[PDB]
Structure formats: structure tokens, C-alpha cells
Amino acid sequence: MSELEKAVVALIDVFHQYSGREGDKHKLKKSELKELINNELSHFLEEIKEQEVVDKVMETLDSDGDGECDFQEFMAFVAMITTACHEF
Amino acid sequence: MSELEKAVVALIDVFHQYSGREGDKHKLKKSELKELINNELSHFLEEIKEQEVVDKVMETLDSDGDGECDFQEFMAFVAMITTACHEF
Ligand SMILES: O=C(O)c1ccccc1S
Ligand SMILES: O=C(O)c1ccccc1S
Ligand code: EMC
Ligand code: EMC
Ligand SMILES: [Ca+2]
Ligand SMILES: [Ca+2]
Ligand SMILES: [Ca+2]
Ligand SMILES: [Ca+2]
């Protein structure tokens, strides 16, 4: 009901809309992450068109080193974005 | 414009609505944190009525030990809530 509570559910909703596409339904593989950024973060982040940019973003977000972005890693990503803007 | 982008701005908006009330306008003191939880997280978290609960929550969220909850500490709090529900 609150605007914060709506944001919490939206974070959960959008992660899983993408993570559930292929393979592990609870983690983002590179193609899932790329589509999430391109479709859902177009006002905040430049569209990803090059493989090396995909690779680098995943390298940055994948803290436990399994090659995918899980929900906790996604939340760290959201923290990164939000802080850059609170800042800009 | 996207539902994710709306969530990112809502997180920024609600933090600052509370953090900007008293003292440091970029950090939540205990009374600011308590009001945020009570007013904005009523579907997710039991209302805070006892001082020891205020104290404990702050103790948990205040990683850099300055006695307040800053925006990065708030994002960790949001991560905690979101993960509990993805889980429930
Ligand atoms: O600037 C960003 O928010 C960012 C985006 C993707 C990967 C790393 C970073 S640090
Ligand atoms: O259960 C929670 O989400 C929580 C809330 C306030 C402080 C610590 C925790 S772990
Ligand atoms: C960069 C203003 Hg949220
Ligand atoms: C506990 C369902 Hg978001
Ligand atoms: Ca997946
Ligand atoms: Ca990972
Ligand atoms: Ca304050
Ligand atoms: Ca602190």
C-alpha cells in the first residue's frame, strides 16, 4: 500500500520476470541481465550493445563467482544505481 | 517510466522524506527510522512501540557505527526486507 512497499514488490517482481526466463529461475544469466538493463533501466543506463559491456557488468555484480546474478547481487546493483542518483 | 525505475526513485524519495526531518538531512536518526518503519512498512514489519526495538534495529542497520542510518545502510535494510519475502 505505501509507496515504499510498492517499490519493494516491484524489485521482486521485475527480477523474477527476467531471472525466470532461462536456466536457474532464481538467477540472472548474462542474456537475462542484459535484457533487464536494456528494457527496464533505459533512463538510468546506456543501452548495452557490446559483449564486453555485458561481460564487465556481470563481472562486477557476480560477488559469489558463480557466473550469474542472484537476487542479493541484484539488490547490490540497485543500491549502486540509487546511490549514483542520489549523487548526480 | 519503467516499474523498476519508479521503484528506484521511490526508495530515494521516501528515505529523504524521513532523513531530512531533523539533524543531518542525509541520515536517519532513531526517531526518523522509527517513523519510516511505522508509517511506510506497516504491511511488512510489526509496528515499533518499545525503545529496545528501536535501539536494536538501529544497532543492526548502522554498519559504520555513527549511530544513524545513512542511505547505503537504508539500502541494505531494503535488501533485508525484500529477501525475507522472496523467502516467505
Ligand atoms: O555505474 C553503475 O551503476 C554500474 C553499472 C553496471 C556495472 C557496474 C556499475 S558501477
Ligand atoms: O527481519 C528484518 O527484516 C529486520 C528488521 C529490522 C532489523 C533487523 C532485521 S534482520
Ligand atoms: C539524479 C537525481 Hg535521483
Ligand atoms: C512473501 C511474498 Hg513477496
Ligand atoms: Ca535465469
Ligand atoms: Ca552470483
Ligand atoms: Ca536526519
Ligand atoms: Ca551509520
Q: Which amino acid is present at B40?
A: E
**Do B28 and B19 meet the contact criterion of CB atoms below 8 Å apart?**
yes
- Residue A26 Cα to ligand 1 midpoint, Å, equals 21
- B64: Cβ–Cβ under 8 A, 6 or more apart, which residues? B70, B73
- Which grid coordinates are listed for A48? 548495452
Radius of gyration of chain A (CA): 13
Per the CB < 8 Å rule, is B82 touching A11? yes
The coordinates were experimentally obtained by X-ray
The CATH number of residue B75's host domain is 1.10.238.10
* Block residue for cell numbers 563467482: A65
The answer to whether residue A4 neighbours chain B at the CB level (below 8 Å) is yes
B75 contact A CB<8A = yes
**How many structural domains compose chain B?**
1
**In A1-88, alpha helices (H):** 3-19, 30-40, 51-61, 71-83
Residue B18 near residue B36, CB atoms below 8 Å? yes
Q: Among residues A63, A66, A33, which one has the least CA distance to residue A51?
A: A33
Residues with CB under 6 A from ligand 1: A 57, 60, 80-81, 84
Place of cell 514488490: A9
Resolution (A): 1.8
Instruction: Domain of residue A2: give its range.
Output: 1-88
